[PDB]
């Protein structure tokens, strides 16, 4: 009776009555002069403590109950409640201006949030989001009102609301909550990530859903194709019941693939790997039948520490992974901290444009006392599992020759000391610089393998920063220009008997896979949560047919042409 399209954020088909997530009434008298200043201050302080304690409960029992690393967002919320930068100005305003806590809180929050959100930085945009969640909570206490939550208490419902706060999603009881649909939110948001973790169907960013649903209405959430249906007709209910069952069936046959090999209908093999940033992501990897690790981000090791990680710490983490993989490929990426990142412990110039300047291997070279410890640690850890090393931001040849020369320096350094190493350690490069693709066949002669970082490559090839909203529209992964460089790299590697993988998010995308297949892509690195689906898709395809499809795409004139070719190909 009513179809509302949105962004699918979690697979599955949920069918239950609508539960409306009612929000607090945060209305209050502005500029109401307070009689008791110290009283008003204590009122605001009480709210802080009350919120602080509530968030400690949510946090600690979020982990131990569902991922010990997912509760990190809450550690980010509690931090906000401890930041003098944010609290002092509120207290100052109440004291000096005699403003009520409600107004002082609003004004200061609005000030900070506006500055951070109108700012081309991920971390800054993240803090604004957190400050939003906590201010609402704190304000709620101040006005003597309550936030929403999960206290049902029956029955099977579909949560309908504007947006689910990270605190709400962590409180969801999959026993009753069949799924949710909200006006706003993102496929990549923290709450929407906890969603697919709880395998709870969800579609997000619909804008209108809240105004389209009355409490008690039957709701179906098609997290498969991303559309919501309010008040289903008899025929629609019957049809989606079957779809929900097929979903469960597919889940079954999907688990019989965890140990199955990835082979196209016409005998062409591929390798499905997983991208990990922390050794806490290992469980998910083996569980999802991964053919190794194609991207191991080692920035998490260097970040958030007093001093840079010793060779020992590193060796410990590398050894652990190589073991956990029992001989399966592990591609470790040299330190590549984004020019626009933290690192509040290192010496680095402000640089007009960080994303073009001193970062990755550029930093690595000329800093061989901070880049070398990593290498000597990788060489000692190699005696365990199958190790691959690769350098980020290699734009030129003799850059690769210098780094490789540094590596062989250590293979000699350790040996003489008494340390044994493995003689088979592949050495490749992270392909993000367009220049490196332009000369692929030259690099292919010297490099053991390529792995494309679409995220970077797209920004450099099209010359636009995805962070800057002004030109973010130029983040076009299905752009023919990109496809051509991709193909160029792949062709070159096979010309030398090398292989090309892709550890950018595009590799795990169910719509970009058939193209990459047809281009000849050897390895697909993705989130472990997508490996099984990729294997199912690839095993049912013919490289021959996808080759012709790809050769039509590279000759398209716009991304719009490509996306349509793909969606309606015969």
- Which residues of this chain interact with Ca ion, rule CB under 5 A? 396
State how far the Cα of 521 lies from the Cα of 499, in Å rounded to an integer. Answer: 8
**Strands 271-276 and 523-526, sheet pairing:** parallel
User: Is residue 471 within the footprint of its own copies (CB under 8 A)?
Assistant: yes
User: Is residue 465 within the footprint of its own copies (CB under 8 A)?
Assistant: yes
Residue number closest to Ca ion, CB atom = 396
120 contact choice in its own copies, Ca ion, none (CB below 5 to 8 Å, kind-dependent): its own copies
User: Is residue 493 within the footprint of its own copies (CB under 8 A)?
Assistant: no
User: Is residue 462 within the footprint of its own copies (CB under 8 A)?
Assistant: yes
User: Is residue 51 within the footprint of its own copies (CB under 8 A)?
Assistant: no
Report which of 371, 245, 387 is spatially closest to residue 321, judged by C-alpha positions.
387
User: Is residue 395 within the footprint of its own copies (CB under 8 A)?
Assistant: yes
Answer for which of 398, 416, 567, 568 binds its own copies (CB under 8 A) is 398
Q: Which stretch binds its own copies (CB under 8 A): 158-166, 259-267, 305-313, 482-490?
A: 482-490
- Which own/partner contact pairs does 452-456 have at CB distance under 8 Å and 24+ positions apart? 452/486, 452/489, 452/500, 452/501, 452/502, 452/503, 452/504, 453/392, 453/503, 453/504, 454/482, 454/502, 454/504, 454/505, 454/506, 454/507, 455/504, 455/505, 456/393, 456/430, 456/432
User: Is residue 485 within the footprint of its own copies (CB under 8 A)?
Assistant: yes
User: Is residue 470 within the footprint of its own copies (CB under 8 A)?
Assistant: yes
Q: What strands lie across the sheet with 202-204, from one edge to the other? A: 2-5, 227-230, 218-222, 13-20, 157-161, 177-182, 202-204, 7-10
Three-state SS for 393-410 is CCCCHHHHHHHHHHHHHH
Closer Cβ to Ca ion, 26 or 462, answer by number:
462
Sequence-separated (6 or more) residues with CB below 8 Å from residue 570? none
Cα distances (Å, whole numbers) of residue 456 to 276, 453, 482: 18, 6, 11
Shortest gap between Cβ of 440 and its own copies (angstroms)?
A: 10
Q: Which stretch binds its own copies (CB under 8 A): 151-159, 162-170, 314-322, 464-472?
A: 464-472
Name the residue with tokens 């208490």: 153
Shortest gap between Cβ of 502 and its own copies (angstroms)?
A: 17
State how far the Cα of 66 lies from the Cα of 62, in Å rounded to an integer. Answer: 6
User: Is residue 434 within the footprint of its own copies (CB under 8 A)?
Assistant: yes
Shortest gap between Cβ of 239 and its own copies (angstroms)?
A: 39
Task: Determine how many CB atoms are found less than 10 A away from the CB of residue 424.
Answer: 9
Interface of this chain with its own copies, residues 331 to 360, rule: CB under 8 A: 340, 349, 351-358
Closer Cβ to its own copies, 474 or 549, answer by number:
474
Answer for which of 476, 525, 527, 530 binds its own copies (CB under 8 A) is 476
Asked whether the CA dihedral 550, 554, 555, 560 is positive or negative, the reply is positive
State how far the Cα of 341 lies from the Cα of 184, in Å rounded to an integer. Answer: 28
Closer Cβ to its own copies, 130 or 432, answer by number:
432
User: Is residue 367 within the footprint of its own copies (CB under 8 A)?
Assistant: no
Shortest gap between Cβ of 331 and its own copies (angstroms)?
A: 22
User: Is residue 481 within the footprint of its own copies (CB under 8 A)?
Assistant: yes
DSSP 8-state class, residue 263: B
153 contact choice in Ca ion, its own copies, none (CB below 5 to 8 Å, kind-dependent): none
User: Is residue 37 within the footprint of its own copies (CB under 8 A)?
Assistant: no
Interface of this chain with its own copies, residues 77 to 136, rule: CB under 8 A: 118, 120-121
**DSSP for 488-544, written as a single string:** HHHHHHHHTT-EEEE-SGGGG-TTTHHHHHHHT--EEEE-HHHHHHHHHHHHT--HH
Shortest gap between Cβ of 484 and its own copies (angstroms)?
A: 5
Sequence-separated (6 or more) residues with CB below 8 Å from residue 60? 71
User: Is residue 371 within the footprint of its own copies (CB under 8 A)?
Assistant: no
User: Is residue 237 within the footprint of its own copies (CB under 8 A)?
Assistant: no
Answer for which of 396, 511, 544, 551 binds its own copies (CB under 8 A) is 396
Size of the site for its own copies (CB under 8 A): 50
Answer for which of 414, 464, 549, 565 binds its own copies (CB under 8 A) is 464
State how far the Cα of 541 lies from the Cα of 538, in Å rounded to an integer. Answer: 5
Shortest gap between Cβ of 398 and its own copies (angstroms)?
A: 6
What residue ranges bind its own copies (CB under 8 A)? Answer: 118, 120-121, 340, 349, 351-358, 362, 393, 395-398, 432-436, 438-439, 442, 459-465, 467-468, 470-471, 474, 476, 479-482, 484-485, 555, 557-558, 560
């Amino acid at each position: 009776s009513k179809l509302i399209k949105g962004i699918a954020a979690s697979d599955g088909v949920a069918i239950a009555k609508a539960y409306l997530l009612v929000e607090p009434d945060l209305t209050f008298d502005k500029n109401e002069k307070v009689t008791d200043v110290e009283g008003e201050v204590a009122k605001f302080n009480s709210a802080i403590e009350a919120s602080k304690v509530e968030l400690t409960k949510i946090r600690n029992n979020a982990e131990v109950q569902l991922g010990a690393d997912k509760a990190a967002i809450f550690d980010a919320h509690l931090l906000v409640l401890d930041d003098p930068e944010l609290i002092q100005p509120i207290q100052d305003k109440i004291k000096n201006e005699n403003a009520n806590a409600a107004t002082a809180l609003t004004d200061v929050t609005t000030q900070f949030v506006t500055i951070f959100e109108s700012m081309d930085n991920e971390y800054m945009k993240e803090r604004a989001a957190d400050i939003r969640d906590v201010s609402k909570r704190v304000l709620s206490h101040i006005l003597g009102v309550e936030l929403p939550n999960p206290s049902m208490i029956d029955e099977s419902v579909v949560i309908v609301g504007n947006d689910l706060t990270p605190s709400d999603t962590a409180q969801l009881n999959k026993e009753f909550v069949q799924g949710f649909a909200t006006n706003i939110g993102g496929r990549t948001s923290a709450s929407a990530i906890m969603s697919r973790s709880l395998e709870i169907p969800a579609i997000v960013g619909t804008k209108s859903i809240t105004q389209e649903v009355k409490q008690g209405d039957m709701i179906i959430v098609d997290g498969l194709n991303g559309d919501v249906i309010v008040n289903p007709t008899e025929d629609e209910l019957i049809a989606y019941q079957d779809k929900r069952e097929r979903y469960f069936a597919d889940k079954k046959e999907l688990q019989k693939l965890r140990d199955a090999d990835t082979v196209t209908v016409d005998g062409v093999h591929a390798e499905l790997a997983a991208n990990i940033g922390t050794p806490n992501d290992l469980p998910g990897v083996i569980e999802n039948g991964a053919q190794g690790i194609g991207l191991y981000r080692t920035e998490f090791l260097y970040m958030g520490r007093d001093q840079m990680p010793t060779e020992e710490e590193q060796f410990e983490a590398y050894k652990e992974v190589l073991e956990a993989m029992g001989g399966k490929r592990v591609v470790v990426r040299t330190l590549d901290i984004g020019g626009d990142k933290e690192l509040s412990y290192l010496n680095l110039p402000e640089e007009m444009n960080p994303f073009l300047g001193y970062r990755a291997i550029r930093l690595s070279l000329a800093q061989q006392d901070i880049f070398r410890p990593q290498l000597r640690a990788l060489l000692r850890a190699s005696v365990y599992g199958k190790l691959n090393i690769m350098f980020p931001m290699v734009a030129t040849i003799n850059e690769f020759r210098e780094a490789k020369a540094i590596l062989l320096e250590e293979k000699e350094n350790l040996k003489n000391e008494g340390h044994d190493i493995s003689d088979d350690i592949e050495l490749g490069i992270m392909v993000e610089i367009p220049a490196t693709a332009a000369l692929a066949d030259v690099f292919a002669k010297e490099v053991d393998f390529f792995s494309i970082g679409t995220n970077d490559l797209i920004q450099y090839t099209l010359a636009a920063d995805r962070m800057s909203e002004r030109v973010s529209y130029l983040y076009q992964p299905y752009n023919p220009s990109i496809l051509r460089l991709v193909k160029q790299v792949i062709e070159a590697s096979h010309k030398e008997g090398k292989w090309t993988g892709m550890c950018g998010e595009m590799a795990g995308d169910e719509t970009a896979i058939p193209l990459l297949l047809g281009l000849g892509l050897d390895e697909f690195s993705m989130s472990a949560t997508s490996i099984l689906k990729a294997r199912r898709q690839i095993n049912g395809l013919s490289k021959n047919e996808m080759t012709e499809l790809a050769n039509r795409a590279v000759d398209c004139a716009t991304q719009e042409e490509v996306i349509e070719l793909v969606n309606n190909y015969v």
